[PDB]
Design an enzyme around this catalytic site. Structure first.
Site: not given
Ligand SMILES: Cc1cc2nc3c(=O)[nH]c(=O)nc-3n(C[C@H](O)[C@H](O)[C@H](O)COP(=O)(O)O)c2cc1C
Length: 367
Positions: A184, A179, A182
């Site tokens: 992060y 991931h 977004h």
């Protein structure tokens, strides 16, 4: 074109998929105390299909990587044991499933940190008060000022990803997804709007791309390129994660992924990109198309897609696989519905992050 190109087989590395409808990773917060529960098994099992690809909710890689309540972890023997039971159920239905490794970086709060310690990030700058963090009691909090970690700690985070990648394989996961979107942890190093470092991890596109390159390479060597997927969102400004040149940053990221594949003599499982969502839509489509053309491998698109949009994306060659988030929440058999073009159920945002193991989780009806 319309004979639904979403249901033509596709080779994702060593994984032979029967259709292109993909479950996008979605935090649901039912993993009480970061321990996968039987409900996660029900939910995923409900959405799994033979030859279909599933991507789990973001998963903790360390005790300092969370920023949401009750999100699953995969850094303890206990967590791996519980995941394994979930993956078996999913595998029994003949589906492929990757575990998304997730580190929130500065998008956290003392309440989610051991000993109430402060969240880490590439910078000491916090998220603006324009964004509020969901709290365990259901209210919203203020993102705190993060701790800008040194180069040594950076390498430790890289190791956390690597070890979690191994635990994933140990739990039976077919693969994992990094991931890196977004806003992060990783996106906090990518986006020049956040990364204000003056060392070798900040400044140029190269330095800013260093962290994700080391993370992907690290997990690649651990479990093999073909079992690793990477998700990014160059043009998503969620949580103050903006960049002066979104498309350039994305190409820079793509170039690194291309080299890693070359150097590893093997291709990644795929590149997974989130779209923002008219001149704005024509602009975004170009951006998405460009990234795809640039990356030597499987491309998965995401962001407000519909049955119509997914069909179009694959038909026009803009993507090989299409992931669906929200619609998959209220439609267990979304794959089936997209196939028959049947009505879809509405989703209840109110129950996206609650803790009930059934309500708004596995009680959305099938056709
Ligand atoms: C309740 C909820 C939880 C989500 N959790 C995650 C997550 O953990 N990791 C991630 O990369 N994206 C996450 N997303 C973003 C989705 O994966 C996906 O990009 C988005 O749903 C795509 O647009 P769509 O809803 O129109 O399909 C989440 C979205 C929602 C609505």
């Amino acid at each position: 074109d319309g004979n639904n190109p979403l249901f033509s087989p596709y080779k994702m590395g060593k994984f032979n998929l029967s259709h292109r409808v993909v479950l996008a990773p979605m935090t649901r917060c039912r993993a009480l105390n970061n321990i996968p529960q039987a409900a996660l098994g029900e939910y995923y099992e409900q959405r799994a299909t033979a030859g279909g690809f599933l991507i789990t909710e973001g998963t903790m890689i360390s005790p300092t990587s969370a920023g949401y309540p009750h999100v699953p972890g995969i850094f303890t023997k206990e967590q791996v044991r519980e995941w394994k039971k979930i993956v078996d159920v999913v595998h029994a239905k003949g589906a492929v499933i990757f575990c998304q490794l997730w580190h929130v970086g500065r998008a956290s709060h003392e309440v989610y940190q051991p000993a109430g310690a402060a969240p880490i990030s590439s910078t000491e700058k916090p998220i603006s008060n324009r964004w509020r963090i969901l709290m365990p009691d259901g209210t919203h909090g203020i993102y705190p000022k993060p701790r800008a970690i040194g180069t040594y700690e950076i390498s430790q985070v890289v190791e956390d990803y690597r070890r979690s990648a191994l635990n994933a394989i140990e739990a039976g996961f077919d693969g994992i997804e990094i991931h890196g979107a977004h806003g992060y942890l990783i996106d906090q190093f990518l986006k020049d709007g956040i990364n204000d470092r003056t060392d070798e991890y900040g400044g140029s596109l190269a330095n800013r791309c260093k962290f994700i390159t080391q993370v992907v390479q690290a997990v690649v060597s651990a479990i093999g390129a073909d079992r690793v997927g990477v998700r990014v969102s160059p043009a998503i400004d969620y949580l103050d994660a903006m960049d002066s040149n979104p498309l350039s940053l994305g190409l820079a990221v793509v170039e690194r992924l291309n080299k890693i594949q070359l150097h590893s003599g093997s291709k990644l499982a795929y590149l997974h990109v989130t779209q923002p969502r008219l001149g704005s839509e024509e602009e975004e489509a170009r951006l998405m198309r460009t990234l795809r053309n640039a990356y030597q491998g499987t491309f998965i698109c995401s962001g407000g897609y519909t049955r119509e949009l997914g069909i179009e994306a694959v038909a026009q060659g803009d993507a090989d696989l299409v992931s669906y988030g929200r619609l998959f929440i209220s439609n267990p058999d979304l794959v089936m519905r997209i196939k028959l073009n049947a009505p879809l159920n509405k989703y209840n945002r109110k129950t996206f992050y609650t803790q009930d193991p059934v309500v708004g989780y596995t009680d959305y009806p099938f056709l």
